[PDB]
Amino acid sequence: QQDLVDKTQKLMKDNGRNMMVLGAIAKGEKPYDQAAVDAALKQFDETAKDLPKLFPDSVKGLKPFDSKYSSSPKIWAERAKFDTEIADFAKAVDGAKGKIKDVDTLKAAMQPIGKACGNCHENFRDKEG
């Protein structure tokens, strides 16, 4: 409880930390790695296996708000759809593991996995800054 809002923030923030390389390549940096993404890849699953848990009513809004977080309170309602959303996300990576191979594919594997990325965002992520 003491440190949860962060534990989650870092967990979700890690998504980008791991995608770092996946990004550079995506943008057009470094002659790709694959092995570097491999990890950052399986990282999407794991992170998507400990995310649907650190979402108490102490870090939502209307009191538990910390004027920083960015997670609509509809995540407690759509808890179901919320999971099923981050559920496939872990399946997308599972497949990306074998799928992934090059860069041209990264964008291909980044189609589904990237779905729960922006989907889980626009669905549960009202970015305001």
Q: Which of 42, 29, 43, 25 is nearest to 105 (CA)?
A: 25
Please report whether residue 43 would count as binding ligand HEC according to CB under 6 A.
no
**Minimum distance from residue 80 beta carbon to ligand HEC (Å):** 13
One symbol per residue from 16 to 35: x for binding ligand HEC (CB under 6 A), - otherwise; what is it? x--x----------------
Q: How many residues bind ligand HEC (CB under 6 A)?
A: 20
Stretch of 9-17, 25-33, 95-103 lying at the interface with ligand HEC (CB under 6 A): 9-17
Among 25, 96, 106, 116, binds ligand HEC (CB under 6 A): 116
CA distances from 71 to 9, 91, 108, 127 (A): 10, 23, 28, 9
CA distances from 90 to 44, 83, 87, 93, 103 (A): 6, 10, 6, 5, 20
